[PDB]
């Protein structure tokens, strides 16, 4: 398949990303608590459902939530201010809460079943969100870094296999603050550092210029 791109909702961020996040890729956004990573996830879950002329892929979404941060009412707001029907947008987001890191890993295997079901339809899965990818692994493997890295490595390998095999954009969030961070090392296809700036602006930089955007009723925008 060719490489598809999903607009983030921000012309600035899209330019930094060469058009948007890519299918057949894992995009990892990392930054401190409150930097806007989950807002970007919510926005992408709407943007992907637009037609290509508007920066989407007419795609369905699968969302794995580890922190109970998915908000359907926020999806509704973004959709209504992106000219989409909110009920239709929510109907094309498959949502699951991961209870722990082992359940999170099983959910990725379960996602493949729905990906296969929708593959030949007019609304194939084009976006798989894992928010937060690292939170359960971090809490469960305190004092056991070597074992944590083994499990994370397999999890990321599973996500890579889905991205490439089924032409999906995988978007993952990772909280990194004071003293923290191996990030995801070199595992993602693309690392995006997100931070707060003056006056509520958000600033994005590729790790390995900078885009600037705001969180609004449209999700994010310049
Ligand atoms: O209905 C489902 C929703 C999911 C969401 C995320 C990951 C896996 C899922 C599997 C489902 O059957």
Distance CA 91, CA 95 (A): 10
**What's the 167 CA to ligand 1 centre distance in angstroms?**
18
Distance CA 82, CA 145 (A): 43
> Distance from first CA to last CA of the chain, Å, rounded?
30
Distance CA 29, CA 193 (A): 6
Considering only CA atoms, which of 201, 171, 207 is closest in space to residue 44? 171
**What's the 164 CA to ligand 1 centre distance in angstroms?**
19
Atom of ligand 1 nearest to the CA of 64: 6
Whose C-alpha lies nearest to ligand 1, atom 2?
A: 94
**What's the 114 CA to ligand 1 centre distance in angstroms?**
7
Report residue 1 as tokens.
């398949």
Whose C-alpha lies nearest to ligand 1, atom 8?
A: 111
Collect all residues with Cβ–Cβ distance below 8 Å to 209 and sequence separation of at least 6. 16
CB burial of residue 206 (10 Å; 0-12, 13-18, 19+): middle
**What's the 178 CA to ligand 1 centre distance in angstroms?**
33
Pinpoint the alpha helices (H) of 10-132.
11-16, 37-47, 72-80, 86-91, 101-118
**What's the 211 CA to ligand 1 centre distance in angstroms?**
32
**What's the 111 CA to ligand 1 centre distance in angstroms?**
5
Collect all residues with Cβ–Cβ distance below 8 Å to 16 and sequence separation of at least 6. 204, 205, 206, 209, 210, 211
Collect all residues with Cβ–Cβ distance below 8 Å to 182 and sequence separation of at least 6. 149
Method: X-ray
DSSP class of residue 4 equals P
Ligand 1 first shell, C-beta below 6 A: 62-64, 94-96, 107, 110-111, 114
Distance CA 69, CA 186 (A): 26
Collect all residues with Cβ–Cβ distance below 8 Å to 121 and sequence separation of at least 6. none
Contact 172, 159 (CB under 8 A): yes
Give the three-state DSSP class for 126. Answer: strand
| Beta strand ranges found along the chain (DSSP E) | 5-6, 21-22, 25-31, 60-65, 93-97, 125-131, 169-175, 190-196, 202-207, 211-216, 219-221
Atom of ligand 1 nearest to the CA of 63: 6
Collect all residues with Cβ–Cβ distance below 8 Å to 58 and sequence separation of at least 6. 49, 50, 51, 52, 122, 123, 126
Taking the CB of residue 125, how many other CB atoms lie within 10 A of it?
A: 27
Query: How many helices and strands, by DSSP H and E, does the chain display?
Result: 7, 11
Contact 63, 46 (CB under 8 A): no
Contact 28, 174 (CB under 8 A): yes
Pocket probe for ligand 1: among 95, 128, 131, 170, the residue whose CB has the most ligand atoms within 8 Å is: 95
């Amino acid at each position: 398949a060719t490489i598809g791109r999903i607009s983030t909702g921000s012309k600035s961020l899209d330019k930094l990303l060469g058009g948007g996040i890519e299918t057949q890729a894992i995009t990892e956004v990392f930054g401190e608590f409150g930097s806007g990573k989950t807002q970007l996830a919510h926005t992408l879950a709407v943007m992907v459902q637009l037609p290509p002329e508007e920066g989407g892929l007419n795609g369905s979404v699968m969302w794995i939530d580890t922190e109970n941060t998915f908000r359907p009412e926020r999806i509704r707001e973004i959709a209504q201010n992106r000219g989409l029907d909110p009920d239709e947008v929510l109907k094309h987001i498959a949502y699951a809460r991961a209870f722990n890191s082992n359940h999170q890993m099983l959910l990725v295997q379960q996602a493949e079943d729905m990906i296969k079901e929708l593959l030949n339809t007019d609304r194939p899965v084009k976006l798989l969100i894992v928010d937060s990818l690292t939170s359960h692994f971090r809490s469960e493997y305190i004092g056991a870094l070597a074992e944590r890295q083994q499990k994370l490595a397999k999890h990321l390998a599973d996500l890579h296999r889905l991205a490439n095999l089924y032409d999906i954009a995988v978007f993952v969030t990772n909280q990194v603050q004071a003293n923290g961070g191996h990030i995801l090392a070199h595992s993602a296809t693309l690392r995006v550092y997100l931070r707060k700036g003056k006056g509520g602006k958000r600033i994005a930089r590729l790790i390995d210029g900078e885009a600037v955007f705001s969180i609004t009723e449209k999700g994010i925008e310049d």
